[PDB]
Design brief:
The complex is a heterodimer. By secondary structure, chain A is low in regular secondary structure. The radius of gyration of chain A is 4 Å and the shape is elongated. Chain B has a single domain (about 1-420), classed as Metalloproteases ("zincins"), catalytic domain like (Zincin-like), CATH 3.90.1240.10. Chain B is of the alpha+beta class. The chains are: A little secondary structure, B alpha+beta. The complex binds sodium ion and zinc ion (ZN). The PDB classes it as hydrolase/hydrolase inhibitor.
Chain lengths: ~5, ~425
């Protein structure tokens, strides 16, 4: 996941 | 090339590498057209409303529930032209990744990472776990089960929520017990994120519009790294997190980041996972591999006719790099384990891929997203296997000008700004  | 065929979405099904298929979601679904781009790897050019029955709605229920970092468009990937471009875009990214030594190493590990046959309730028999297969419609209309390691599928409702998904087991934690399981990566080559070139700006939630675009090959590689951890059953439990204390904005909101993500990014981020826990994980997985060797030694018969017991035992000897003595008894070599574990966790990282692609990229996972852009990497005039957006022999070749959304503005359409909305 790319994330925040 | 990694992908021998340059598939067109409208190519006729053949029941082999172009076919209508169904996935074991334990639910009822209509067959979807899929393409086998490489041994053990398929691409399904559809939005993922399958791996999770509770995520079959591509529409935003309200207009204020979801996080600021999200993007919705129920129509994306609903037409044949879009699916054709999706297939071509994913294929090109696989080639870009495969063109680097690191990518070749990662993809090879992935192909060799067959989910373990641990679905037998009798230790004398070796049995495949049926959720690590897909049902392929043959030319005669009948269904045939095929084992596979990876599926690239379109995103669910949130277009930019890229991630690895896999079917679980009633008891076993397949992604954390060394077994591994078929990985479904929700991903799109048609969008990308914008980040900032200055660290103080990139890591601040109130600054920057997203001047530089993340190369989608890095994004896919990132997901493939997760897939690798999961296929070898060594993913770190998401409950194991880092209470970020190196960023006032993260800390002021109690934001936590999983070790699995820090590991995957690599570089300095991986250092946030303390040595004591790192060793704890290493020992844990080491034991899991021992149990697999043990299970293989107990196997006295194989279930099915797809392959021989000796063939399957050898398949897993190669996957886990087990040692075979005189009586053909398997065991886990400490040195070989450490080397394989390290390869999958330290060698294959986002940070290392950046070095190989020679692209500009976020310097840390601990930052704040700036924006999301619509892109089209299919045309060679826009993006190539060799240079990504930074096309050699053009004004985009140097200083990452191709990734500079201001200079190479014709290749990016900003769809949403995240800055100031966290
Ligand atoms: Na976020
Ligand atoms: Zn991730």
């Amino acid at each position: 996941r790319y994330g925040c | 090339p990694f992908v021998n065929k340059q598939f067109n979405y409208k190519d006729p099904v053949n029941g082999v590498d172009i076919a209508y298929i169904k996935i074991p979601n334990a639910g009822q679904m209509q067959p979807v057209k899929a393409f086998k781009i490489h041994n053990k790897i398929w691409v399904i050019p559809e939005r993922d409303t399958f791996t999770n029955p509770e995520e079959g709605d591509l529409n935003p229920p309200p207009e204020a529930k979801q996080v600021p970092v999200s993007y919705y468009d129920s129509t994306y990937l609903s037409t044949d032209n879009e699916k054709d471009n999706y297939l071509k875009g994913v294929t090109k990214l696989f080639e870009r990744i495969y063109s680097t030594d690191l990518g070749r190493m990662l993809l090879t590990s992935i192909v060799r990472g067959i989910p373990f046959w641990g679905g037998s309730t009798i230790d004398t028999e070796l049995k495949v776990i049926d959720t690590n297969c897909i049902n392929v419609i043959q030319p005669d209309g009948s269904y045939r089960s095929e084992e596979l390691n990876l599926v690239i599928i379109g995103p669910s409702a949130d277009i930019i929520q890229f991630e690895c998904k896999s079917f679980g087991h009633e008891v076993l934690n397949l992604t954390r017990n060394g077994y591994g399981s078929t990985q479904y990566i929700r991903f799109s080559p048609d969008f990308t994120f914008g980040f900032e070139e200055s660290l103080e700006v990139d890591t601040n939630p109130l600054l920057g519009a997203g001047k530089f675009a993340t190369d989608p090959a890095v994004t896919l590689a990132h997901e493939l790294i997760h897939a690798g951890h999961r296929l070898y059953g060594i993913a770190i439990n998401p409950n194991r997190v880092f209470k970020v204390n190196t960023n006032a904005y993260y800390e002021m909101s109690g934001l936590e980041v999983s070790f699995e993500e820090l590991r995957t990014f690599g570089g300095h981020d991986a250092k946030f996972i303390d040595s004591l826990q790192e060793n704890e994980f290493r020992l844990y997985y080491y034991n899991k591999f021992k149990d697999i060797a043990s299970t293989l030694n107990k196997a006295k018969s194989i279930v099915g006719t797809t392959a021989s017991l000796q063939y399957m035992k050898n398949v897993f000897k190669e996957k886990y790099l087990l040692s075979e003595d005189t009586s053909g008894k398997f065991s886990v070599d400490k040195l070989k384990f450490d080397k394989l574990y390290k390869m999958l966790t330290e060698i294959y990282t986002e940070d290392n891929f950046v070095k190989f692609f020679k692209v500009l990229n976020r310097k840390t996972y601990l930052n704040f997203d700036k924006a999301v852009f619509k892109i089209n990497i299919v045309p060679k005039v826009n993006y190539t296997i060799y240079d990504g957006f930074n096309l050699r022999n053009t004004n985009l070749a140097a200083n990452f000008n191709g990734q500079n959304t201001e200079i190479n503005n014709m290749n990016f359409t900003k769809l949403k700004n995240f800055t100031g909305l966290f």
